[PDB]
Amino acid sequence: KQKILIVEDSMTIRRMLIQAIAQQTGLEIDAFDTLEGARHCQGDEYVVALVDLTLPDAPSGEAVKVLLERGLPVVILTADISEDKREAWLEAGVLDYVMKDSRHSLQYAVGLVHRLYLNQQIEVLVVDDSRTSRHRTMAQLRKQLLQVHEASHAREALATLEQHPAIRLVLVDYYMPEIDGISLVRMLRERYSKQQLAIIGISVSDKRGLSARYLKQGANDFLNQPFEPEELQCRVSHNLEALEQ
Amino acid sequence: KQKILIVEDSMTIRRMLIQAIAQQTGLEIDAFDTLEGARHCQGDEYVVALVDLTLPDAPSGEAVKVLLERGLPVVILTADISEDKREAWLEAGVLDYVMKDSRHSLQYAVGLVHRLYLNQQIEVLVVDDSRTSRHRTMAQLRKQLLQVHEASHAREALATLEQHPAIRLVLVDYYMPEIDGISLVRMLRERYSKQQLAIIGISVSDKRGLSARYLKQGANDFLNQPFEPEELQCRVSHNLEALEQF
Ligand SMILES: [Mg+2]
Ligand SMILES: [Mg+2]
Ligand SMILES: [Mg+2]
Ligand SMILES: [Mg+2]
């Protein structure tokens, strides 16, 4: 998919977004000032929809549910944020939100739609012996439009990598039965450079240098648990962009 | 400074390091199998010295102090690490340590020296109202060979950036009186894009979702306190590389 949907009645915001996405990403764009303009829009044509909560024919966020139910991933455009609003949106299945209170916050949308577009073709692997942790991380990576493989043990991870050599990034949990995180990182790096297979080591900063041990064994990066979805997206995106650049 | 010193008696390891550093960095390399061989090397010519603890004439790590006192920054080459071993080193003046138990672990030194070379010409700013955290972060960054400016509050940060436009990366503490970290980030971003001035937001990871707040305000990155030096080095390196390549 090569097209971005924007539904936003502010002439200024809509134009800022079209100009920026057009110039920086070269992606196709449909932009409407009403939910009614976006009526023909189906999920299979758009990477993602950037959706205002203040539309003339949907003044209280109604466009969000409407577009989610047509199969469009949605990123909410918002002037305000709160803990309650964040939780509500994320519960309804919204991918993310973008602050539109300033031009620099609005710029977040531009890097995001470019990232989401590139992610569509990218295979990643989560390796974690905690089902709860594994499923949370997978869900969150799936909301980045990545194709996400799952493994509950290093043995499974190694087997999945052999079967799917398109996987380009692996997130690695530190403590697992038989073969722990650092040990799996050593095994992978005995075969693959940081440019062939990016590795993010999942750590805790309440240990005696787990992140350090990851890096000295050739992990591209670290991420400490517990982590927010916004932290995950930031860290994954960077490492994916390192691979492309 | 564009030269590197290597003092390592393993033929295999020294040659691996020479090959990789010659191939992947623009650095000149002087390598020796004994400390005596490196006698006349002067501190002002070398970016860093990669230093074995097991040398024929310094079998218990004596070469580290010797080269430190010649004004060379030192990265230790070690076959095995403990928490007790990184203990005595960093409190002596070591830049970092590199594991030499495998080819892939050696490769960390390659990336490191390349980055240490590049960091010499790069200016950064630490903004933090806590004296100890501000001083430690400054010390750690200085160990990455960066040129490091400090600010105790947003007002001083801004004045510093005005006086030193070469600064390309700011690390911003969240809790500061009068003007907080997110407010400073907002002011900086009204003028400068993520490509013009990199911003790493430092916070504690709790219920306020501060990391998220930084990112949505245009911070390039986040780092949660408390953090280890390798964590800061990793983060700063990634952001500097982003400015150079993305
Ligand atoms: Mg509106
Ligand atoms: Mg585990
Ligand atoms: Mg030796
Ligand atoms: Mg503070």
The DSSP-derived string for B8-76 is ---HHHHHHHHHHHHHHS--EEEEESSTGGGTT--TTTEEEEEEESSBTTBTTSHHHHHHHTTT--EEE
Q: Where are the alpha helices (DSSP H) in chain A?
A: 11-25, 62-69, 83-91, 103-119, 131-142, 154-163, 181-189, 210-216, 229-244
User: In angstroms, what is the span from residue A128 Cα to ligand 2's centroid?
Assistant: 6
Q: Which two tokens stand for residue B227?
A: 């953090």
Q: What is the dihedral of CA B135, B140, B143, B148, to 10 degrees?
A: -50
Q: Using only C-alpha atoms, what is the Rg of chain A? A: 19
Tell me the residue type at B224: N
Q: Could you count the other beta carbons within 10 Å of the beta carbon of residue B194?
A: 20
How many angstroms separate the CA atoms of B179 and B154, rounded? 6
- Residue B106 DSSP code: H
Q: Which helix (H) or strand (E) holds B89?
A: helix B85-90
State the structure-solving technique. Answer: X-ray
| A209 interaction partners in chain B (CB closer than 8 Å) | 83, 86, 228, 230
Place of tokens 């758009």: A46
Single out the residue of B3, B10, B25 nearest to residue B112, CA to CA. Answer: B25
Single out the residue of B121, B137, B119 nearest to residue B129, CA to CA. Answer: B137
CA of B153, nearest ligand number = 4
Contact A83 B209 (CB under 8 A): yes
Q: Which helix (H) or strand (E) holds B183?
A: helix B181-189
Smallest CA–CA distance from A200 into chain B, residue: B234
Q: Which two tokens stand for residue B100?
A: 């030499």
SS3 A111: helix
User: In angstroms, what is the span from residue B99 Cα to ligand 3's centroid?
Assistant: 13
Place of tokens 């340590």: B97
What length does chain A have? 245
Give A53-57 contacts, CB < 8 A, sequence gap 24+: A53/A77, A53/A78, A54/A9, A54/A79, A55/A7, A55/A8, A55/A9, A56/A9
Contact B212 A230 (CB under 8 A): yes
How many angstroms separate the CA atoms of B243 and B246, rounded? 6
Which of the residues A216, A231, A238, A241 would you substitute to probe the B interface, choosing the one with the greatest number of B C-beta atoms within 10 Å?
A: A216
Single out the residue of A112, A133, A105, A128 nearest to residue A50, CA to CA. Answer: A112
Q: Which two tokens stand for residue A66?
A: 């409407």
Query: What interhelical angle do A181-189 and B103-119 show, nearest 10?
Result: 90
Tell me the residue type at A96: D
Q: Which of A102, A211, A231 sits opposite B222 (nearest CB)?
A: A231
| B246 interaction partners in chain A (CB closer than 8 Å) | 241, 245
Q: Is the peptide bond before B226 cis (omega within 30 degrees of 0)?
A: yes
- Kindly list the distances between the CA atom of residue A11 and the CA atoms of A15, A39, A100, A130, in Å, as whole numbers in the listed order: 6, 20, 13, 47
Single out the residue of B58, B68, B77, B56 nearest to residue B6, CA to CA. Answer: B77
How many angstroms separate the CA atoms of B48 and A26, rounded? 44
What distance, in Å, lies between the first and last C-alpha atoms of chain A?
A: 22
Contact between residue B21 and residue B110 where contact means Cβ atoms under 8 Å apart: yes
How many angstroms separate the CA atoms of A10 and A75, rounded? 16
Single out the residue of B101, B75, B74 nearest to residue B12, CA to CA. Answer: B101
What are the residues whose beta carbon lies below 5 Å from ligand 3 (ion)? B 9, 52, 54
Contact between residue A174 and residue A151 where contact means Cβ atoms under 8 Å apart: no
Contact between residue A178 and residue A151 where contact means Cβ atoms under 8 Å apart: no
Contact between residue B216 and residue A99 where contact means Cβ atoms under 8 Å apart: yes
How many angstroms separate the CA atoms of A223 and B223, rounded? 10
User: In order of start, what are the domains of chain A with their CATH numbers?
Assistant: 1-120 (3.40.50.2300), 121-245 (3.40.50.2300)
Smallest CA–CA distance from B78 into chain A, residue: A216
Q: Which helix (H) or strand (E) holds A125?
A: strand A123-127
- Kindly list the distances between the CA atom of residue A229 and the CA atoms of A141, A225, B78, in Å, as whole numbers in the listed order: 9, 11, 37
On whether any CB of chain B is under 8 Å from the CB of A184, the answer is no
Q: Where are the beta strands (DSSP E) in chain B?
A: 3-7, 28-32, 46-52, 74-78, 96-99, 123-127, 147-151, 169-173, 198-203, 221-224
How many angstroms separate the CA atoms of B197 and A26, rounded? 24
Burial of B23 (0-12, 13-18, 19+ CB in 10 A): exposed
Q: Where are the beta strands (DSSP E) in B103-190?
A: 123-127, 147-151, 169-173
CA of A129, nearest ligand number = 2
- Kindly list the distances between the CA atom of residue A156 and the CA atoms of A126, A129, A159, A177, A214, in Å, as whole numbers in the listed order: 11, 11, 5, 12, 20
Query: What interhelical angle do B181-189 and B154-163 show, nearest 10?
Result: 30
Phi-psi region of B71 (alpha: psi -120 to 50; beta: other; left: phi over 0): left
On whether any CB of chain A is under 8 Å from the CB of B90, the answer is no
Place of tokens 């894009």: B193
Backbone angles phi and psi of A230, in degrees to 5: -70, -30
Specified resolution (Å): 1.8
User: In angstroms, what is the span from residue A225 Cα to ligand 2's centroid?
Assistant: 11
Non-local CB neighbours of B55 within 8 Å, separated by 6+ positions? B7, B8, B9, B33, B34, B35, B62, B63
Q: Which two tokens stand for residue B27?
A: 């650095």
Q: Cα B115 vs. chain centroid, distance in angstroms?
A: 8
